[PDB]
Amino acid sequence: VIPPPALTDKLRLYHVDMNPYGHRVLLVLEAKRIKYEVYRLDPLRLPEWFRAKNPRLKIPVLEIPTDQGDRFLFESVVICDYLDEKYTRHTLHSHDPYVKAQDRLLIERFNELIKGSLECFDTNFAFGSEQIIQTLEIFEKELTNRGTNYFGGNRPGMLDYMVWPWVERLYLLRCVNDRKFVEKKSLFPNFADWGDQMQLDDIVKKHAHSPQEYFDYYKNARAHSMGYYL
Amino acid sequence: VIPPPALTDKLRLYHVDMNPYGHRVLLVLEAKRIKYEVYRLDPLRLPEWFRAKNPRLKIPVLEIPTDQGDRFLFESVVICDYLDEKYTRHTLHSHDPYVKAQDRLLIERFNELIKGSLECFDTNFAFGSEQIIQTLEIFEKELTNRGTNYFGGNRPGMLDYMVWPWVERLYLLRCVNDRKFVEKKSLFPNFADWGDQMQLDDIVKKHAHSPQEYFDYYKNARAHSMGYYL
DSSP, rough: OOOOOOOSSSSSEOOOOOOOHHHHHHHHHHHTOOEEEEOOOSSSSSOOOHHHHTTTSSSSSEEEHHHHHHHEOOOOOHHHHHHHHHSSSOOOSSSHHHHHHHHHHHHHHHHHHHHHHHHHTTTTOOOOOHHHHHHHHHHHHHHHHHHSSBBTTOOOHHHHHHHHHHHHHHTTHHHHHHHHHHHHHHTTTHHHHHHHHHOOHHHHTTTTOOOOHHHHHHHTTTTTTTSSOO | OOOOOOSSEEEEEEOOOTOHHHHHHHHHHHTTTOEEEEEESSSOOOHHHHHHHHOOBOOOOEEEEOSSOEEEEOOHHHHHHHEEEEEOOOOOSOOOHHHHHHHHHHHHHHHHHHHEEEEEHTTTOOOOOOHHHHHHHHHHHHHHHHTTTTTTTTOOOOHHHHHHEEEEETHHHHOOHHHHHHHHHTHHHHHHHHHHHHHHHHHHOOEEEEEHHHHHHHHHHHTTTSSBBO
């Protein structure tokens, strides 16, 4: 009910627990080693001052200091790109504008996997598997074409972290149908390999949950708080 | 049926005549003073080699030289941002990452005006006026808050040109209902003023059509070739 104080030395993320768009921003902040605090939003009991600054209830929100005072920044892509431009250390986007443009196109393409996953977790993991699979074929071919351990090269870059939150959630499906999951996984050998490597990343590990934890969460909550708005 | 030759000194835009997403890219290319040629696409009689390189038939397409050969670049936002990064002269985005993030948020917000305009030109200018008006209120307030002649400051910037193609098309509505148009216009005095100033811009003038020309075009063609895909 009472808002937090004015920002000092840390950036502030307003985030709904288990929201993948917030997970995205958490990964980038950590990768860029920027100090931040998380203000946990309750999707039900939402503060009036928050709605007032965010009438469409978009999530997550990164609050930053500016010349004219503390400001809300919206939309996970815009937020993460802001962070990559503002803070010059530990750059995540490619230095090559062509490669970066391709990375941006792939982020947009990934939205089809997001849509399918959203419907899936909303309907006891019964539907939209096909959207997942089709998108995974594109990313398998793309990773193979690049011939690096990650989309970013020898180390994870912006595309890797942008895509990860949904990929990490997919592992919950092994709790639903173990055998059907492993078969599906085998279709994308380089992507699967990349998944394993991403799981070992210190930044990933900081904000990770297990297959079981995601499974117990999504069965009860479904997708009510999974979108880019509440 | 026969594709154009390999690129040399000019970039190549594949563009459907009167398509506002292509109009966007034409404005930026001109603003950045980059040499280019336009390959006019017939939405009906489409070349097989084009479909093959672009199976979802996205428009426009900017073909560019790369280290590995000539490549298609898709999506007008990605295309224009590529151009602004690749070519360092005549920069269009703000140097301030916060201001640029706001500009990106406004481009996304503008999609609501695009949707309304799309439906409008598709249905003999009878529907979706309300989406237009609501978006115009946001941009009026934003331009007022900035207190400059343009969204980019003293001169037009990326946001100005990104938004212009749809704004220029709106003037056709004065051919439909003169009196209802002028009243609606008077609601947004700073935006209207900006519109007048944009019309005098040398870059705008290069790729402009009149209210009547848009009106005669849209009545016959409707919105069939107006989207970001064919």
